[PDB]
Amino acid sequence: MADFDNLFDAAIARADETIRGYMGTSATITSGEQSGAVIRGVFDDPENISYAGQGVRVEGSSPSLFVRTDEVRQLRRGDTLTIGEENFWVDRVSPDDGGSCHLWLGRGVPPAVNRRR
């Protein structure tokens, strides 16, 4: 006793990707005309509660970014990561042990559309 059969199929094209990164603060590195990778950085501000007096037209604020030597190693110097608020590039961070770097990064808003007060 035996049997047999047949069939057909096709062929197309696709892509690939990866998803992994959970240690510190969730961030999305973005320093280019159009970029968005996985980064673990956190922005630290001196005092969310601050004002002027309807005097100055432009203010300045540069929070701190907490990342690991490795996490920051995969990137270059001047990479503005958008986390919590907006992509912010860090000047230079130098950890001491266990990937613990922190430096005041500069502001940076992506090309995305955001509502202003």
Side-chain angles (χ1 to χ4, degrees):
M1 293 90 136
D3 279 292
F4 210 61
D5 283 283
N6 210 20
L7 50 78
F8 55 99
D9 270 309
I12 343 183
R14 291 297 301 186
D16 209 28
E17 42 143 82
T18 34
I19 302 296
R20 205 264 298 285
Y22 175 70
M23 199 185 255
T25 287
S26 327
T28 290
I29 35 174
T30 310
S31 194
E33 52 156 304
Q34 177 148 83
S35 228
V38 53
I39 190 259
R40 301 164 219 162
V42 80
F43 86 110
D44 302 296
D45 243 65
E47 197 197 337
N48 204 246
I49 311 180
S50 208
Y51 267 85
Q54 306 183 85
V56 184
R57 54 175 287 162
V58 56
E59 218 147 305
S61 93
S62 49
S64 205
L65 137 67
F66 196 104
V67 273
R68 149 162 298 202
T69 160
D70 291 289
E71 259 293 2
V72 67
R73 172 260 204 177
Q74 296 157 340
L75 293 87
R76 74 119 193 286
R77 281 141 112 278
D79 247 86
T80 157
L81 42 127
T82 171
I83 124 273
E85 179 170 357
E86 298 162 329
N87 61 79
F88 308 138
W89 53 266
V90 102
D91 222 277
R92 260 205 283 190
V93 305
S94 271
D96 188 63
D97 164 62
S100 270
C101 346
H102 55 113
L103 196 289
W104 48 89
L105 33 62
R107 79 225 94 162
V109 192
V113 292
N114 164 243
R115 311 215 241 79
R116 240 257 170 166
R117 172 63 274 291

Coordinates of all heavy atoms in Angstrom, one line a residue, residues 17-29 37-41 67-68 70-71 74:
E17 N 14.9 42.3 11.3 CA 15.1 43.3 12.3 C 15.3 42.6 13.7 O 15.3 41.4 13.8 CB 13.8 44.2 12.4 CG 12.5 43.5 12.3 CD 11.5 44.1 13.2 OE1 10.8 45.1 12.8 OE2 11.2 43.5 14.3
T18 N 15.6 43.5 14.7 CA 15.8 42.9 16.0 C 15.2 43.8 17.1 O 15.0 45.0 16.9 CB 17.4 42.9 16.3 OG1 18.0 43.9 15.7 CG2 17.9 41.5 15.8
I19 N 14.8 43.2 18.2 CA 14.2 43.9 19.3 C 14.7 43.4 20.7 O 14.3 42.4 21.1 CB 12.6 43.8 19.3 CG1 12.1 44.2 17.9 CG2 12.0 44.5 20.4 CD1 12.3 45.7 17.7
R20 N 15.6 44.2 21.3 CA 16.1 43.9 22.6 C 16.8 45.1 23.2 O 17.6 45.8 22.5 CB 17.1 42.7 22.4 CG 17.3 41.9 23.7 CD 18.5 42.4 24.5 NE 19.7 42.2 23.7 CZ 20.3 41.0 23.6 NH1 19.8 39.9 24.1 NH2 21.4 40.9 22.9
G21 N 16.6 45.4 24.5 CA 17.2 46.5 25.1 C 16.4 47.0 26.3 O 15.5 47.8 26.2
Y22 N 16.6 46.4 27.5 CA 15.9 46.8 28.7 C 16.8 46.7 29.9 O 16.9 45.6 30.5 CB 14.7 45.9 28.9 CG 13.9 46.2 30.2 CD1 13.2 47.4 30.4 CD2 13.9 45.2 31.2 CE1 12.6 47.6 31.6 CE2 13.3 45.5 32.4 CZ 12.6 46.7 32.5 OH 11.9 46.9 33.7
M23 N 17.5 47.8 30.3 CA 18.3 47.8 31.5 C 18.1 49.0 32.3 O 17.8 48.9 33.5 CB 19.8 47.8 31.0 CG 20.8 47.4 32.1 SD 22.5 47.5 31.6 CE 22.9 45.8 31.4
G24 N 18.2 50.2 31.7 CA 17.9 51.4 32.5 C 16.7 52.2 32.0 O 15.5 51.7 32.2
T25 N 16.8 53.3 31.4 CA 15.7 54.1 30.9 C 15.4 53.9 29.4 O 16.4 53.8 28.6 CB 15.9 55.6 31.2 OG1 15.7 55.9 32.6 CG2 14.9 56.4 30.4
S26 N 14.2 53.7 29.0 CA 13.8 53.5 27.7 C 14.0 54.8 26.8 O 13.4 55.8 27.1 CB 12.4 53.0 27.5 OG 12.0 52.2 28.7
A27 N 14.8 54.7 25.8 CA 15.1 55.8 24.9 C 15.2 55.4 23.5 O 15.4 54.2 23.2 CB 16.4 56.5 25.4
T28 N 15.1 56.3 22.6 CA 15.2 56.1 21.1 C 16.2 57.0 20.4 O 15.8 58.1 19.9 CB 13.8 56.2 20.5 OG1 13.0 55.1 20.9 CG2 14.0 56.2 18.9
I29 N 17.4 56.6 20.4 CA 18.5 57.4 19.8 C 18.0 58.0 18.4 O 17.5 57.2 17.6 CB 19.8 56.7 19.6 CG1 19.5 55.2 19.3 CG2 20.6 56.8 20.9 CD1 20.7 54.4 19.0
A37 N 16.8 54.4 16.5 CA 17.2 53.1 17.0 C 16.8 52.9 18.5 O 16.1 53.7 19.1 CB 18.7 52.9 16.8
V38 N 17.3 51.8 19.1 CA 17.1 51.5 20.5 C 18.2 51.9 21.4 O 19.3 51.5 21.2 CB 16.8 50.0 20.7 CG1 18.0 49.2 20.1 CG2 16.6 49.7 22.2
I39 N 17.9 52.8 22.3 CA 18.9 53.3 23.2 C 18.4 53.4 24.7 O 17.2 53.6 24.9 CB 19.4 54.7 22.8 CG1 20.6 55.1 23.7 CG2 18.3 55.7 23.0 CD1 20.3 56.0 24.8
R40 N 19.3 53.2 25.6 CA 18.9 53.2 27.0 C 19.4 54.5 27.7 O 20.4 54.4 28.4 CB 19.3 52.0 27.8 CG 18.8 50.7 27.2 CD 19.6 49.5 27.7 NE 19.7 48.5 26.6 CZ 20.7 47.5 26.6 NH1 21.5 47.4 27.7 NH2 20.8 46.7 25.6
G41 N 18.8 55.6 27.5 CA 19.2 56.8 28.1 C 18.1 57.6 28.9 O 16.9 57.5 28.5
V67 N 23.7 56.7 30.6 CA 23.9 55.5 29.7 C 25.1 54.7 30.1 O 25.9 55.1 30.9 CB 24.0 55.9 28.3 CG1 22.6 56.1 27.6 CG2 24.8 57.3 28.2
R68 N 25.2 53.5 29.5 CA 26.4 52.6 29.8 C 27.4 52.8 28.8 O 27.1 52.9 27.6 CB 25.9 51.2 29.9 CG 26.9 50.2 29.5 CD 26.6 48.8 30.0 NE 26.6 48.7 31.5 CZ 26.8 47.6 32.2 NH1 27.0 46.5 31.6 NH2 26.8 47.7 33.5
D70 N 29.0 50.8 27.1 CA 28.7 50.0 26.0 C 27.6 50.6 25.1 O 27.7 50.8 23.9 CB 28.3 48.6 26.4 CG 29.5 47.8 27.0 OD1 30.4 47.4 26.2 OD2 29.5 47.6 28.2
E71 N 26.5 50.9 25.8 CA 25.3 51.5 25.1 C 25.7 52.8 24.3 O 25.3 53.0 23.2 CB 24.2 51.8 26.1 CG 23.1 50.8 26.1 CD 22.3 50.8 24.8 OE1 22.6 51.6 23.9 OE2 21.3 50.0 24.7
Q74 N 28.4 52.0 21.2 CA 27.8 51.6 19.9 C 27.5 52.9 19.0 O 27.4 52.8 17.8 CB 26.5 50.8 20.1 CG 26.7 49.5 20.8 CD 25.4 49.0 21.5 OE1 24.5 49.8 21.7 NE2 25.4 47.7 21.7

